[PDB]
Amino acid sequence: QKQPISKLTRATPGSAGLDLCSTSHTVLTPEMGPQALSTGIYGPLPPNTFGLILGRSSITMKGLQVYPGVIDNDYTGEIKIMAKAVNNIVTVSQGNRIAQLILLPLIETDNKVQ
Amino acid sequence: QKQPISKLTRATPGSAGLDLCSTSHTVLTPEMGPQALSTGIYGPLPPNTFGLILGRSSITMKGLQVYPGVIDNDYTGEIKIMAKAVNNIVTVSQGNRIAQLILLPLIETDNKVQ
Amino acid sequence: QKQPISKLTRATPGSAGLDLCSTSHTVLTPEMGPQALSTGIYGPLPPNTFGLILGRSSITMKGLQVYPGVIDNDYTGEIKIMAKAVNNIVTVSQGNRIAQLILLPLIETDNKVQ
Numbered sequence: 001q002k003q004p005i006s007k008l009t010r011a012t013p014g015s016a017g018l019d020l021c022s023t024s025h026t027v028l029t030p031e032m033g034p035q036a037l038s039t040g041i042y043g044p045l046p047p048n049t050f051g052l053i054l055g056r057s058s059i060t061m062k063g064l065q066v067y068p069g070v071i072d073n074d075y076t077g078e079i080k081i082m083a084k085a086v087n088n089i090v091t092v093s094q095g096n097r098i099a100q101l102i103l104l105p106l107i108e109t110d111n112k113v114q
Numbered sequence: 115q116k117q118p119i120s121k122l123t124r125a126t127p128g129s130a131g132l133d134l135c136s137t138s139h140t141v142l143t144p145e146m147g148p149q150a151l152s153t154g155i156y157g158p159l160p161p162n163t164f165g166l167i168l169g170r171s172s173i174t175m176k177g178l179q180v181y182p183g184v185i186d187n188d189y190t191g192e193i194k195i196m197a198k199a200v201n202n203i204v205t206v207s208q209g210n211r212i213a214q215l216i217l218l219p220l221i222e223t224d225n226k227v228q
Numbered sequence: 229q230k231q232p233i234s235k236l237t238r239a240t241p242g243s244a245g246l247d248l249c250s251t252s253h254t255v256l257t258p259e260m261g262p263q264a265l266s267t268g269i270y271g272p273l274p275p276n277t278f279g280l281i282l283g284r285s286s287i288t289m290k291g292l293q294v295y296p297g298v299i300d301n302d303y304t305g306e307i308k309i310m311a312k313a314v315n316n317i318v319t320v321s322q323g324n325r326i327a328q329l330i331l332l333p334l335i336e337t338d339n340k341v342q
């Protein structure tokens with residue numbers, strides 16, 4: 001906060017995603033349903049791109065589901081992770097990488113804005 | 115019905131997704147599991163693109179999960195939204211925007227058709 | 229095993245995804261939560277691409293959720309499908325197509341590797 005996406009890092013040079021961590025310690029239970037986790041990272045995105053927030057596989061396998069999120073090109077708010085404990089109680093420590101941002105080309109169309 | 119994807123609209127000029135609404139009022143409960151919601155919008159998609167159906171974040175946070183769906187380039191059927199109430203009873207009013215279509219480049223490969 | 233992604237096939241010429249089958253018969257129950265299903269298919273991916281593993285819609289509607297998975301460009305391990313039975317007991321027969329691989333352009337950025 002406020003940190004831009006240029007501050008994120010890749011696990012490795014060939015990693016498709018930029019890792020996202022929560023800035024808070026959060027405990028999630030299945031009955032809580034979707035929770036929006038703060039990242040302290042803000043849009044916007046590089047020109048002609050949009051973002052997809054996806055889970056990391058190791059986190060998904062530990063029972064924390066990240067719902068795929070679309071980040072619009074010109075979003076300037078805080079990127080949050082939408083997360084749910086699937087079956088069990090899940091504990092997110094401050095700073096642990098819990099999702100990833102993928103950048104994709106934004107295709108232009110003639111669809112109207114409405 | 116039958117309406118083509120060119121009829122969809124963007125929330126804003128920089129919105130990555132084209133919004134999809136259900137043409138029916140639908141109530142979903144968790145025990146129902148995945149339901150396919152009618153949109154009255156039909157493929158196919160622009161040349162060299164395919165589609166991804168994703169949830170809208172505000173709808174996801176209200177407890178309606180949209181399962182990511184792939185729309186093939188030459189699909190000419192009705193685009194449906196695969197949806198589930200996560201934890202609670204969810205009510206979809208006719209016309210409310212419940213998902214979004216994202217267009218992505220379709221990469222060509224030499225993989226066989228089988 | 230070890231089979232490369234070039235061995236996968238498309239349902240049809242205009243299908244966005246390359247189908248993935250499990251090499252094992254697997255039974256899944258909701259209380260099991262996420263399971264990683266073996267495919268016997270291995271990265272890496274074509275240059276300048278990364279992969280997304282998504283469910284097939286017919287499988288999603290039958291109550292088997294595939295969590296979207298990111299496949300890094302230079303991953304050389306086995307591509308596994310992360311799957312959960314949503315509400316009911318689901319049975320995956322050996323060889324049935326249970327997910328699909330989508331290839332997408334890998335955008336280069338100046339983000340650091342850390």
Ligand SMILES: O=c1ccn([C@H]2C[C@H](O)[C@@H](COP(=O)(O)NP(=O)(O)OP(=O)(O)O)O2)c(=O)[nH]1
Nearest residue numbers: 053069070071072075078079080125170171172
């Ligand atoms: O996982 C997410 C998804 C969205 N977002 C932010 C960025 C995105 O540009 C913004 C809007 O997201 P979506 O459109 O999915 N949401 P919705 O349609 O409900 O809001 P709007 O009508 O403003 O587009 O919410 C996140 O921070 N995390």
Ligand SMILES: O=c1ccn([C@H]2C[C@H](O)[C@@H](COP(=O)(O)NP(=O)(O)OP(=O)(O)O)O2)c(=O)[nH]1
Nearest residue numbers: 167183184185186189192193194239284285286
């Ligand atoms: O959310 C979705 C997903 C798919 N679809 C439609 C468009 C897509 O081209 C078509 C086939 O989808 P998938 O392949 O995911 N499905 P499946 O592999 O089960 O059917 P097929 O063997 O015909 O490809 O179903 C939707 O309408 N909504």
Ligand SMILES: O=c1ccn([C@H]2C[C@H](O)[C@@H](COP(=O)(O)NP(=O)(O)OP(=O)(O)O)O2)c(=O)[nH]1
Nearest residue numbers: 011056057058281297298299300303306307308
């Ligand atoms: O559904 C999936 C997701 C990932 N994978 C493999 C390929 C991918 O390159 C590798 C790493 O995946 P992610 O990064 O999502 N995982 P995580 O961040 O937990 O591991 P790492 O720190 O190595 O990137 O796991 C699959 O086989 N199936």
Ligand SMILES: [Mg+2]
Nearest residue numbers: 011015017056
């Ligand atoms: Mg990773």
Ligand SMILES: [Mg+2]
Nearest residue numbers: 125129131170
């Ligand atoms: Mg929106």
Ligand SMILES: [Mg+2]
Nearest residue numbers: 239243245284
């Ligand atoms: Mg298919």
